């Protein structure tokens, strides 16, 4: 599942 643009 890919992480949101700001998850990092």
């Amino acid at each position: 599942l890919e992480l949101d643009k700001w998850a990092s």
Partner: antibody
Amino acid sequence: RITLKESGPPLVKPTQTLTLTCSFSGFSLSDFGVGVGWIRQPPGKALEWLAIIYSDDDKRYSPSLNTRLTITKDTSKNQVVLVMTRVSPVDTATYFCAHRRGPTGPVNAMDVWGQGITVTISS
Amino acid sequence: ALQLTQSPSSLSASVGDRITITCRASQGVTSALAWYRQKPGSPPQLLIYDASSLESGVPSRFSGSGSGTEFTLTISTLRPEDFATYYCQQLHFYPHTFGGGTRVDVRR
């Protein structure tokens, strides 16, 4: 502050293409990290995420609708456009576009929504 | 993808009541969960962002807590305008999922 308004045809024939436009003010698609998303809601049903596009132009579509959706942005017009192909009656719903704050923490939410445009698919 | 389960899906209450509804995620979404209230005929309205932060302008009776896979929205004292449908949304993974919603109506 920020407001958004969806526009497009209220009535679309099955198979045809549905083109929606989100016009907004109070922010621009050149502010850092800012996004504009599309959410739909079938009559009496729950909200369904469709897609989102950002200032730097990356975008994401809902996995199930991604060979049918295309999201773009014209920054001189301050508009975002969503194109959905081969619509069918199940696509009948209210379509909302919404704003997502960019990093200044609170990017975790769609903070301002349009009033929504209800689109009916029928031949 | 990520399944967000809201419960109860339907809830009956009265003005002045204290209610707490939940939103469960199948995978951890850290604190990237938002809560909205939607009244019939109107678009969703942000209440809580980032799981526990009260959105500017939102009444103090609303509060949220949780992290990872468990989240709750509490209304300290139910008002007439609160009889609506509430939704949670996680913005940690793509696609951004919405829960199925919780319906709060007037008890009789």
